Design a protein around this ligand. Sequence first.
Ligand SMILES: O[C@@H](CC1c2ccccc2Sc2ccccc21)CN1CCCC1
Ligand SMILES: O[C@@H](CC1c2ccccc2Sc2ccccc21)CN1CCCC1
Ligand SMILES: *[C@@H]1O[C@H](CO)[C@@H](O)[C@H](O)[C@H]1NC(C)=O
Length: 334
Amino acid sequence: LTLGNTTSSVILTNYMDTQYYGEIGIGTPPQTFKVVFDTGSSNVWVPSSKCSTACVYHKLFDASDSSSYKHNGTELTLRYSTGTVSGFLSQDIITVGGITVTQMFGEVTEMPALPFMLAEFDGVVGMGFIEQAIGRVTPIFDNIISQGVLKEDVFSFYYNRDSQSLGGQIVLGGSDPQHYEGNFHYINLIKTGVWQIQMKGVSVGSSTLLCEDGCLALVDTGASYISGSTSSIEKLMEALGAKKRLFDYVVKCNEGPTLPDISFHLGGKEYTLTSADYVFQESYSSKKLCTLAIHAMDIPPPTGPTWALGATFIRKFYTEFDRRNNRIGFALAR
Ligand SMILES: O[C@@H](CC1c2ccccc2Sc2ccccc21)CN1CCCC1
Ligand SMILES: O[C@@H](CC1c2ccccc2Sc2ccccc21)CN1CCCC1
Ligand SMILES: *[C@@H]1O[C@H](CO)[C@@H](O)[C@H](O)[C@H]1NC(C)=O
């Protein structure tokens, strides 16, 4: 007997405003892993004990220590913006904030030192739809929905700004009103299968200089930043006075607080980020260079070309992902 009144939460760790990770347990007895909960992907994967470069710094799943494990072994390859992992399929019981689910997941045996040596998390829990799942593997949230335990078929994200403070939180089955102010404003997904909405414009202060004839916005919990196409970012950075370095865009630290507001027109409203929301203000010196929490990412079709609203956006706006209604809700984070 499963009664739909459950609302479970996973505490997240904030690593330098770029990586937000929580704990999941795999197997019997449970083997714990630090995972990023990512709306931009649909597969679950952790490093395998069968891993032969980045594997050395992470926790590895040993199937031989789990009584609940069921072999499969189908080969699997997962491509991310940052890097590609490879392994095989395994099935086991996954515990996520109290909820226990029988899940098919990836046992990663090929984890390159770049970029995975830089990951503070062990694996990824893809919070996207089956349409985007590799090997057509049933996503974890789809499996939790099938159990009929959740209060509502929704999950929400809270990302805090980096004492003994909470780095973030995921709520499965609801939203935590302690982490948002006012009410949610919802935007319907263009289509089911992808956590993507229509964007009606991007404004720099006064003038709406980009996305004038509309564009797409992927609401990506796994993305550290706000990203646009190379073309869109080059124009945006020019309007900000930012300069291209090797991996990032920079401004003189003293100019940082003088930077204009960036607005994203989504559904009925404008979602504004002030300079304090997008500049890593590590100094105020005129002789130092400060990094922006904005970059270029060319997302390939069918999903891209698209903007991605990552942790930079989510820190400002507490986000709710509604599977029942196929919509996303935003509320000012508290
Ligand atoms: O953490 C930083 C990003 C980090 C990184 C992680 C995964 C994949 C690529 C890169 S590029 C790179 C290069 C050299 C050192 C570290 C890094 C971002 N910074 C901005 C705020 C926190 C620091
Ligand atoms: O956004 C970050 C990407 C992040 C990540 C998140 C979800 C799923 C896969 C990966 S791959 C990976 C590997 C190592 C460290 C971090 C990460 C990387 N960014 C840092 C600066 C912008 C790029
Ligand atoms: C692995 O699992 C898939 C279902 O996701 C199934 O179709 C396939 O036959 C399985 N392979 C093996 C070798 O068990």
